[PDB]
A paper describes a structure:
Transketolase (TK, EC 2.2.1.1) is a thiamine diphosphate-dependant (TPP) enzyme which plays an important role in the pentose phosphate pathway. It catalyses the rearrangement of sugar molecules by the transfer of a C2 unit from D-xylulose-5-phosphate to erythrose-4-phosphate, resulting in the formation of fructose-6-phosphate and glyceraldehyde-3-phosphate which are fed back into the glycolysis pathway. Here, we report the biochemical and structural characterization of the ‘split-gene’ TK from this organism (ChTK-F) which has been reconstituted by combining the two proteins encoded on the C. hydroxydothermus genome. This is the first example of a ‘split-gene’ TK that has been reconstituted and found to be active.
Later crystallization trials using PEG based conditions and an excess of TPP and Ca2+ ions resulted in crystals of the ChTK-F α2β2 protein. Changing the precipitant to malic acid (2.1 M DL-malic acid pH 7.0) produced crystals in the same space group but which diffracted to an improved resolution of 1.4 Å and had full occupancy of the TPP cofactor in the active site. The ‘split-gene’ ChTK-F protein forms a heterotetramer with a ChTK-C dimer and a ChTK-N dimer coming together to form a similar overall arrangement to that observed in full length TK and TK-like group enzymes. As other TK-like group enzymes the ChTK-F is formed by 3 domains of the α/β type, the PP-domain (ChTK-N), the Pyr-domain (ChTK-C residues 1–162) and the C-terminal domain (ChTK-C residues 164–312). The PP and Pyr domains are usually connected by a long flexible linker region in other transketolases and much shorter linkers in DXPSs and bacterial PDHs, however in the ChTK-F structure the linker between the PP and Pyr domain is missing. The enzyme contains two identical active sites that contain the cofactor TPP and a Ca2+ ion bound between a subunit of ChTK-C and its corresponding ChTK-N. The TPP molecule has three moieties, a diphosphate group, a thiazolium ring and an amino-pyrimidine ring and adopts the higher energy V-conformation present in most TPP-dependant protein structures. The diphosphate group is held in place by a number of hydrogen bonds formed with residues of the CHTK-N monomer (Lys68, His70, Gly149, Glu150, Asn178 and Lys240). The Ca2+ ion is held in place by interactions with residues Asp148, Asn178, Leu180 and the oxygen atoms on the diphosphate group. The amino-pyrimidine ring is held in place by another series of hydrogen bonds from both ChTK-C and ChTK-N (Glu55C, Gly117N and Leu119N) as well as a π-π stacking interaction between the pyrimidine ring and Phe80 from ChTK-C. The major difference observed when the structures are compared is the absence of the linker between the PP and Pyr domains which could explain the ability of ChTK-F to turn over the bulkier substrates phenylacetaldehyde and cyclohexanecarboxaldehyde.
Residue numbers in the entry:
A (entry chain AAA), C (entry chain CCC): -1 to 280
B (entry chain BBB), D (entry chain DDD): 2 to 312
């Protein structure tokens, strides 16, 4: 089975992205493990199966584009781009250091494969709408993929951008929501409840597909359904576990923006390596 | 009397659209008023109304600039510079993207819409942004030159425009160079540095001053950022006293920019004509300029004060 | 009986507000007749039946509040406040003039009865949510009424404010949408389509009531239904005619922000006076 | 080695909540980081998280101020001053409403979050607003005094705060007076005017200068608006040269405010130490201050330049 082997390989790549996230945040003493780990299966599917991209031609005009609108999750994007060959893996060890290209939030002028400088929440999504608008005008076959946080959708610019994407019929824009239920000050339902989230996106003119964001076949199937929907954009609402893959980080508000100490990096890598050895058994 | 800078802008956009396939134009339900409507009629395929949504206007412009378009984004200055400030900061200026912001209805000459619509802060906001260039045309001829130059240069540009017809200052041959100001009149006693609607008023003040035996140099500084440091120092050395004149707060705009340069290089009096750290109010443009001290006679009074401080 | 006489009196007051709007915009050579005339029946019901206010005590702590979020419709608000006795009717003849209290957009520090300085679209609605939040904390019986435009709801701050009003359960906030279908550059569906508007408000946690915004009994009944709904905020979507009451202004994009010339003032007042004489026949 | 100004702010808010039932506090999902969390725990019924929605944060604060509350609204300076600029302008400053904006994580000392989060423009934005007062504490003691004074003032106030621990400068008895600066050291040769983290560095620079026979006056100007014009002119008369030092762009902040005053009242050299019209980058706070020229040694270098320019 090449399809079954394809899925196993994507699970192994997702595990590698998680190991990079834990190590690079530990070494930096700074960064955002929870919302990086929640998105690792989504970025494995995008960067290693679904996106048309070439690290030997990073300015290819018809390339698919990924925008990390929740830019604090830069570790998982940098892990994906390093594993795809956009820049040396050695860069990951200088994350958040002075003079390093790997800034705490992505800088499109310093990192090959970064399509927008993000880090101010809501702004990446608005720029993704502009990219999709221009590519639609240029008859490009390109698709624009954009990852949002579920705290991030409290920003007014997200709803402006959604209204505009529906009005301009941007069926070349696929939004993905990292639906992990947590933000800095607590659960999103306690801080500023955005529910009913699927009803809001449908009322703004998006097709909505709900998936388990840790189920690689469901993510693949949702991206195929988005491609076939021509009336306008689609959002994939991906139910995820913040800190997915590390027992002591899973569903924990406090692992949003805290760096693990060396003993916690060792514990997290041991869990992920036990997970990886079990995949090599398949 | 000449056409409004917004009218010259709308015509210059059509000229750019005819000769430059990469130009696209965006508005926020003010196309009728900003005069992006001329481009919207000529090139509807490259015109995008974003509705009443200035943050998304600037984010969508940023994204279009990454797909090889040269976007001009328009609305009134209070909404362009203020409502979308942090989108301009973090999605346009930090990544140095090729977006042109052409904001109309700046200053008190907005008139009867009153204080909420009268931008007196926009130059302070745009001048503090790294990688932003800030250009403030005096009249129709200089507006056309600035709009065409903005489309040629790489990176973020803010063009400040106005509502009402303004007098001719520059000839049809005007050449605009970022970082270069223009001496419009020579004089040994004082230098008046002006931009926007105030340049024509500075020339009228210099005629009034000549009648009482005062010879004023007049400098246009449409290029607010980068400012012409060398011309400011030359003027300070020749005349020993400066009046600045701007349809803007005396805080953070032209008076501030000139005080910063001369206090570092050649300290002289800099007496500032502008809005005195207040909001505006509803009235006719002319009644507002009179009440808020933005007339040729106010520039004459500022020159008399500056001459009392001159070494 | 007294109910039918009450309705007739409100229709006569609405006609008087429309006559003030046409005359004061004509005299000023400046202002916004279309979106003032669309709202005249709503402000007749609020200022002459439903709101608890006292022109002798404009800072009464438990007063109802009205916020004109679509602040360019200041003529109809000023007409209502003058007819309610908040300031002299003579003020109306100096609308938009230098050194006069009646600013082009409402100024709460210059005009008795104005609750917020508005004019920047979306902002009045956000301040209204803050007023309702503070009045709820103090268990005030006050209601906060706020009028929105249907172009205005393209602003992101409107959706932030809506999300917050639902999260804080502000049943003391009654929003009203002036649903006239037009904005400056054309029909709202052409410029930046906000449809489906009722679905958007329901998905943001508001009860939605749809009315004919020129039917005074429907407006009264909708306000009573909002009052009885204690679980959260209500929006009344009031379908209106921009320029209602003046034949040559009705449903015309170009009468958004243009002042009638003296011949047009005379024609408009003749139509409104013929309308008024017909009401005195009932 | 003192506590961070954000930590002093969080404790001062709890003190205000105990003293005054009208105090309410708002945040935008950064309560853990701004230290509004102390008040949120003590007074949950008077604490309102608005989620990640800074425009609505400031509009809701404006509305609360009209229902007998004294709101303190917090988020990081880039988002407070910039994302919500035009709401602060048109819903708070124009109507002169009683809202206090306490914005943390200003300057380069934010560190590893990098350029998008390092506010280098916020003082330019808040200084240009009519009716806004702008206060920049040096340390924990001055933070507590400024927060308590802001609650007593009627009208808009911006308090600029920081992420990292900063050295003690003021005693716990400090009295804060809007429009008054403080002479922390006397000297005849030059005046160093500073605020925020730069006040302690100006005192370190003055010790280095004393060792090479240069006597620097050191002035703290936490009161940026209204600025102490009289103390600036006194300093110009005594010393003939000023260096300004700020963790902010050289455009539109302290250096600009001092140049504006002295150019109209007593023109002398004003040499500006600050961020040189660039965005920041990710790094440790100390590595960033060194790279971007915000050290005591950079203030010494600026003083040497100012001495070559003075009469
Ligand atoms: C509140 C805040 C965060 C929580 C996000 O929460 P989220 O979207 O739910 O992301 P998650 O997938 O759970 O990690 S991060 C950064 N930040 C500060 C922040 C605040 N405002 C703006 C405009 N940009 C920011 N950068
Ligand atoms: C576009 C615009 C208008 C159309 C409203 O259209 P609307 O809400 O549908 O109002 P209506 O009931 O039909 O009159 S007015 C003023 N203006 C400029 C305008 C733009 N942006 C901001 C923040 N505030 C403004 N004031
Ligand atoms: Ca470590
Ligand atoms: Ca989340
Ligand atoms: Ca008239
Ligand atoms: Ca409308
Ligand atoms: Cl895994
Ligand atoms: Cl010329
Ligand atoms: Cl009628
Ligand atoms: Cl002290």
């Amino acid at each position: 089975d090449d399809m079954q082997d394809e899925i196993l390989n994507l699970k192994l790549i997702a595990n590698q992205l998680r190991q990079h996230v834990v190590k690079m945040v530990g070494e930096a003493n700074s960064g955002h493990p929870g919302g990086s780990l929640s998105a690792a299966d989504i970025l494995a599917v995008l960067f290693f199966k679904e996106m048309r991209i070439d690290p030997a031609n990073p300015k290819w005009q018809d390339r698919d584009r990924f925008v990390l609108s929740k830019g604090h999750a830069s570790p998982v994007l940098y892990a994906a781009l390093a594993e795809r060959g956009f820049f040396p893996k050695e860069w990951l060890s200088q994350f958040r250091k002075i003079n390093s290209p790997l800034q705490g939030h992505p800088d499109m002028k310093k990192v090959p494969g970064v399509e927008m400088s993000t880090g101010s929440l809501g702004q990446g999504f608005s720029t993704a709408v502009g990219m999709a608008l221009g590519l639609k005008l240029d008859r490009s076959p390109a698709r624009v993929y954009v990852l949002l946080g579920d705290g991030e959708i409290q920003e007014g610019i997200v709803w402006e951008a959604a209204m505009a994407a529906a009005h301009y019929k941007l069926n070349n824009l696929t939004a993905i929501l990292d639906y992990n239920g947590l933000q800095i000050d607590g659960p999103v339902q306690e801080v500023m409840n955005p529910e009913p989230v699927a009803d809001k996106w449908r009322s703004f003119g998006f097709k909505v597909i709900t998936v388990d964001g840790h189920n690689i076949p469901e993510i693949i199937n949702a991206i195929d359904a988005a491609r076939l929907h021509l009336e306008g954009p689609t959002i994939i609402i991906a139910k995820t576990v913040k800190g997915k893959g590390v027992s002591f980080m899973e569903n924990r508000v406090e692992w949003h923006g805290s760096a693990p100490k060396p003993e916690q990096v060792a514990e997290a890598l041991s869990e992920l390596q036990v997970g990886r050895e079990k995949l090599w058994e398949e | 009397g000449g056409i409004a800078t917004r009218e010259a802008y709308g015509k210059a956009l059509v000229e750019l659209g005819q000769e430059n396939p990469k130009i696209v134009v965006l508005d926020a339900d003010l196309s009728k008023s900003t005069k992006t409507s001329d481009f919207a009629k000529a090139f509807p395929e490259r015109f995008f109304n974003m509705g009443i949504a200035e943050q998304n206007l600037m984010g969508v412009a940023a994204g279009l600039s990454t797909v090889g378009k040269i976007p001009f984004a328009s609305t009134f200055a209070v909404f362009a510079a203020g409502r979308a400030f942090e989108i301009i900061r973090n999605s346009i200026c930090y990544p140095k993207l090729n977006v042109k912001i052409a904001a109309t209805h700046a200053g008190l000459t907005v008139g009867e819409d009153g204080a909420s619509h009268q931008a007196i802060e926009d130059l302070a906001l745009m001048r503090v942004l790294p990688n932003m260039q800030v250009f403030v045309p005096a009249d129709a001829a200089q507006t056309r030159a600035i709009v065409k130059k903005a489309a040629e240069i790489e990176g973020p540009v803010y063009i400040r425009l106005g509502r009402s017809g303004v007098p001719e200052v520059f000839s049809p041959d005007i050449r605009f160079e970022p970082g270069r100001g223009t001496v419009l009149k020579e004089g040994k006693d004082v230098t008046i540095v002006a931009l926007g609607i105030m340049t024509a008023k500075a020339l009228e003040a210099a005629k009034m001053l000549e009648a009482e035996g005062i010879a004023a140099r007049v400098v246009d500084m449409a290029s607010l950022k980068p400012i012409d440091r060398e011309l400011l120092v030359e003027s300070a050395r020749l005349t020993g006293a400066v009046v600045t004149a701007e349809e803007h707060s005396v805080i953070g705009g032209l008076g501030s920019a000139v005080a910063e340069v001369l206090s570092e290089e050649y300290p002289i009096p800099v007496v500032k004509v502008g809005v005195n750290d207040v909001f505006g109010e509803s009235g006719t443009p002319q009644a507002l300029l009179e009440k808020y001290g933005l007339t040729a006679r106010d520039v004459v009074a500022a020159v008399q004060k500056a001459l009392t401080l001159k070494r």
